Every structure is written in C-alpha cells, then in structure tokens.
Amino acid sequence: ERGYSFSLTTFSPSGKLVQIEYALAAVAGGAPSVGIKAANGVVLATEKKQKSILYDERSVHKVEPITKHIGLVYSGMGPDYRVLVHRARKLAQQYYLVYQEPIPTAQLVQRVASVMQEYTQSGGVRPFGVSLLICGWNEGRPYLFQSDPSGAYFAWKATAMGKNYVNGKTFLEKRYNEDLELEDAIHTAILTLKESFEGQMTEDNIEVGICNEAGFRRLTPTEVKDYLAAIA
Amino acid sequence: NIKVLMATNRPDTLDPALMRPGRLDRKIEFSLPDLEGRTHIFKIHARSMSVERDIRFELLARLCPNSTGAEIRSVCTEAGMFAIRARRKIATEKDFLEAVNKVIKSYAKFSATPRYMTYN
C-alpha cells in the first residue's frame, strides 16, 4: 500500500520478544479448551458460552475439519482464527494436488507454523492471537499437536489452553493417563472442561469432536447432550 | 530612567524577547569575529611585549577564521608561553603561529565552539 514494511516486533533490552508475550497474554484471555489423545483417536473439546439467550449456536462452529480426517480448534480470538483456518484449507490442497495423497498432520503443523512464524516478522502486522490444537489419524497412530503465536509447535499427550490452563494442566497431569478408550477420553475431557465452567453445561455450551482412525466425525448435540448427562 | 542594557546567549527566552517589541528597542548583535577587527584584537597585544620588526599582523590575521576574541588573545600570549619555556628572549610570529595552527586545530579538533549552533 505504501511499502512501509518495517517490523514493529523488535527485541527488548533483555532480549524478549514483546509482542509474542503480549499475544500469549491475549491467548490467556481466551476461552478454555482441552484435547486428549487416547489409544485409538483424539478427542478435542471446546467451551462455547453464548453471551445471551438471544444467540444461535447452530451458526458458528468451533471444531472445524480440515480434511476428512483432520480437526482443528483454538483458544484465542476467532477473527484471527478463521484466516489461518482458510489458509490451512487452501494449504492442504496443494499437497493433495501434487502428491495425490491425504496430507499428514505432521506436515500441516510444519507448514502452518511456517506461515505463522514467517508472519511474525513481515511488514507491519501484529501476530495472530490464536493457539491451535490440531488432531488427526494418519498412518495408524493418531496425533495431537499444538501451535502458538510464537510459531512453535509441540506434541502433547493431553493438553489444555485458554483460561485456567494450569488448573486443567495439573488436572490432566494425574487424571489423564497411560491409555483409555475413545469414550473414556470424552469423560475426562468433559470433566476438565467442567473444571472452569458456569453452573450448567448443556449441548449448547460444549462442542466436542473426535477423530476415528477410519475418519473424522464432528459430533452432534444429540450425543453431546447424551454424554454430559452423566455430569462428565 | 535607567533605560536598560541586556546581554544573553540564545534567542529564547521568548516571552521577554516577544515582550521587548512590546516595550524595548534596539536589537543589535556581536561582534563576533571579523576579517579586520582581529587585527585590533591582535593590536590589543600591540603595545604589549615589544613587537619584532618583522612580525606581521595580516599574515596571522588571514589565517584565523571564526576567532572571536578569547583564544586569539591567548594565541598571541602562547608565544610567551613557549618563549619563557624555550628561553626565547622575544617572540617571532613564526614561533607561536607554529603553536597557533596547533592551538587552533588542537582545540578545534574536539571543540569548534559552534556559536552559530548555540542560538540556533
């Protein structure tokens, strides 16, 4: 537009990236979420409270598929979320055009991490305020990855981001464990999302997606209401 | 009934300097170095010492830009510096002008004394 193109993200006198720290604080101001890998597939749980009774929960979805076997949720701000959602949507399809093969999630988080780290340095932008959880079932062992505004990427067994992630972190330190089943991950995931919720949790509050090894399937409020019935 | 006479450095402070057109008059200026008056600042040393018959003013006067009066009064004086030190009975213009081109440069290496910058 002008060619100003100077990076407003600079180093501190201590040596700390300041905008990445503040962006991680903006991650900490976001909605809580937790995701657990257990021995056949990966269950992602998010926590969506509409600010009024006027609202519609049928419109906006948080668990958003990327392929027919790859899901992706966040903990941060939605308007910065959907951009790299769409960037991952276009980005997987060049892999499906070149190699003619379902893209591995390991390759996704490499490339999306390259986009985000490459975006922290470019001409005059703030970084994204989004911390992603990316799941999927490739080659027989289901994966769960987490990215962040620093462009880094981790490989967690069962983590949690958003509000009270040290509370859900210590809760997922002991209560999460060696190996479960697909339904057994849902129980402890709804419990650890029931760590920091309000006085009621319905089919409109939570929204839970899974990855089978045979393929992705986002769940419906019928079973989302049936499992949390059965408080966790 | 005393009128007034006021000397300063910089144009600020502005308020009496913008009040002086509301009262005062006669804004004039130093003087300051000139191509000529340095010969009188070099003739403030005229009756001093005893000027060697071959010592010339214009020779040194043309060599010293932006001299004010301060250093170039000591410029003629630093002859007597090395004179007493080197035992020189009286001084020749070549004696100090060796230390002058020194003392101007040696003292203009670090400090140009930018009087133009002080009020600007």
Partner: protein, 240 residues
C-alpha cells in the same frame, strides 16, 4: 495499561487487548440510530428510523435500507461513509459469487467474506478499521429466514433477534424479555414487536413517516421495503 504506540495503531497492549477495535465499537455511537432485526417463523423484519433535521433534506435518499441482491437485504448503522463503502463490496462479492459459482449466494457466506475483509482491515497496521456495523437478512433452502450481524472486528455472527447501535444495550435486554416465552411468531406479531421493542426504548410513539421497515417472507422471497400506507396500517394496527 499502555506501552509504546498501542494507543494509536492496532498492536497489542501489555494486558492482551488492542484499543483500536474497542474504539471502533463506539465508533457506531455517533450515528444516533436504533435498528432491530427479528426472525419470525417464515419471515424476518428489519426496522430502522431516520432523522430529518431539515425540511430541505429528502426522504428518498437517507434510507439506510440497502438492497444487496434480489434475495438479500441489509441495513446499516455506524458512520455513513464506512457503511456505504461496505455496501459496494457486498454487492460486488455477491455478483462474483453469481459469476463464479452459478447459483445464488447464501446469506451465511457473504458475512464470512465481509468479516474476512474487515479482518484484513484490522490485521494490517496502517489502515483504518472501518467503524460501521453490518446487519443482513435473507432466505435459505429449508433453513427459513436468517439474520446476521457483522461488527467491525471481523466475525460473522447471527442470531434469533439481534440489535446493535446506540441504544441497543437496553434493547437486547428487552428482547431477552420478549423472546424467551411460549409465544410463536406470526407476521404481524413480528412487525408489532419490531415497533414496540423500539417504542419501549425511545418512548415517543410517533408518526409512520419515521421508521423504515424492510421485510422478507417466504411467499415471495424478494427483499421488499414497505410503503408508508401499510406501515401506517401496522402502526395503528398495534394500537388497541
């Protein structure tokens, strides 16, 4: 809180919140407008008003009811220039949907498009974030009428009955008191709530030359702005 230039451009504060967008959320409030959208069973009603401070200004130009396509209407709040500059991008992207994909655009996707462009206005640091607030209605296959709202923060957003602008902090509190009950929604029930929800706010109970009502209804799904006569028919039809 503040650190550096965070009070000036769209960069982060030390607490985790940009200030330019939360200035844009009260960039709407200079307009002076209440606008309420209500989704009925088979219909949806936009209600607005206008201010005519001169007798020399027109009634035919100041209508905020802008038509996007022949199945999509919209109404604008916030400041005027950002609102109209949003409209040609809405019309233009609707027309490119018609050229590229061949079928009529759902009202859902256009708010994702406008929300993403408003994100690109927010994301990049040297461009103003367009302090207008976008409100859509429309008809979809087997999904009834729909209402959506696009704030200048970049999220597509749409509910059962929503209103943003100046006075709407209490208007949403009235619509919570009016929606959650055992009442259904007929046509004149939705129109008769669309006036009275706003008349509870302003407490004026005024002439039918002030509110502009655009409506859509699945008998004839084309967006339609009511004539003043039938507006008067509703407005005295509510007076028992």
């Amino acid at each position: 809180s503040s650190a550096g230039f965070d009070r000036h451009i769209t960069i982060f504060s030390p607490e985790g919140r940009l200030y330019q967008v939360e200035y844009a959320f009260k960039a709407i409030n200079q307009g002076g407008l209440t606008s309420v959208a209500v989704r009925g069973k088979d219909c949806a009603v936009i209600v607005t008003q206008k201010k005519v401070p001169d007798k020399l200004l027109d009634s035919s130009t100041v209508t905020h009811l802008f038509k996007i396509t022949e199945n999509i209407g919209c109404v604008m709040t916030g400041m005027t220039a950002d609102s109209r500059s949003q409209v040609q991008r809405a019309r233009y992207e609707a027309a490119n949907w018609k050229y590229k994909y061949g079928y009529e655009i759902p009202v859902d996707m256009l708010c994702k498009r406008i929300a993403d462009i408003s994100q690109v206005y927010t994301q990049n640091a040297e461009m103003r974030p367009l302090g207008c607030c976008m409100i859509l209605i429309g008809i979809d296959e087997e999904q009834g009428p729909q209402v959506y709202k696009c704030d200048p923060a970049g999220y597509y957003c749409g509910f059962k009955a929503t209103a943003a602008g100046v006075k709407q902090t209490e208007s949403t509190s009235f619509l919570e008191k009016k929606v959650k009950k055992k009442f259904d929604w007929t046509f004149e029930q939705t129109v008769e709530t669309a006036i009275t929800c706003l008349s509870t706010v302003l407490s004026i109970d005024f002439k039918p030359s002030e509110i502009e009502v655009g409506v859509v209804t699945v008998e004839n799904p084309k967006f339609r702005i009511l004539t003043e006569a039938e507006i008067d028919a509703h407005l005295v039809a509510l007076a028992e």
